[PDB]
């Protein structure tokens, strides 16, 4: 996604509390982008006796 975070001229990466990459900068366009995961949690089954 696209974010509006300010960056320094010599900064490269942004790191979250979990110490994992979240925000990057495009090496050839010089614009800032943000990374988020895509999946989610699990399911459950309701059933009477077999």
């Amino acid at each position: 996604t696209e974010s509006n975070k300010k960056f320094l001229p010599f900064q490269q990466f942004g790191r979250d509390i979990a110490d994992t990459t979240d925000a990057v900068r495009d090496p050839q366009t010089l614009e800032i982008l943000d990374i988020t995961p895509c999946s989610f949690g699990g399911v459950s089954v309701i059933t009477p006796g077999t």
Partner: protein, 100 residues
């Protein structure tokens, strides 16, 4: 007994002491009405809850909400105000308050 009985005028079935209690404790964030994509927009300043969520640690809602708990309480108190202590064993039996 106007300070303990539930107040009809309130939009929710609660009583003034309970109402004063609820605002004196800072409950953690919850509600779960909608969660996906929340921290993508205006919450781009990430909150701790979705940061926890993204790593697979979750919480679950309780079986009984607050409303039915208030209902049980407004049941027990109404039972003990107008029937002495007999309704704990058998059928309810009414007694005037001063004799009790």
């Amino acid at each position: 007994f106007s300070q303990i009985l539930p107040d009809p005028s309130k939009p929710s079935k609660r009583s003034p002491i309970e109402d004063l209690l609820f605002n004196k404790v800072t409950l953690a964030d919850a509600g779960f009405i909608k969660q996906y994509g929340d921290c993508l927009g205006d919450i781009a300043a990430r909150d701790l809850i979705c940061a926890q969520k993204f790593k697979g640690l979750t919480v679950l809602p309780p079986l009984l909400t607050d409303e039915m708990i208030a209902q049980y309480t407004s049941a027990l108190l109404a039972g003990t105000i107008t029937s002495g202590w007999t309704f704990g064993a058998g059928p309810a039996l009414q007694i005037p308050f001063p004799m009790q």
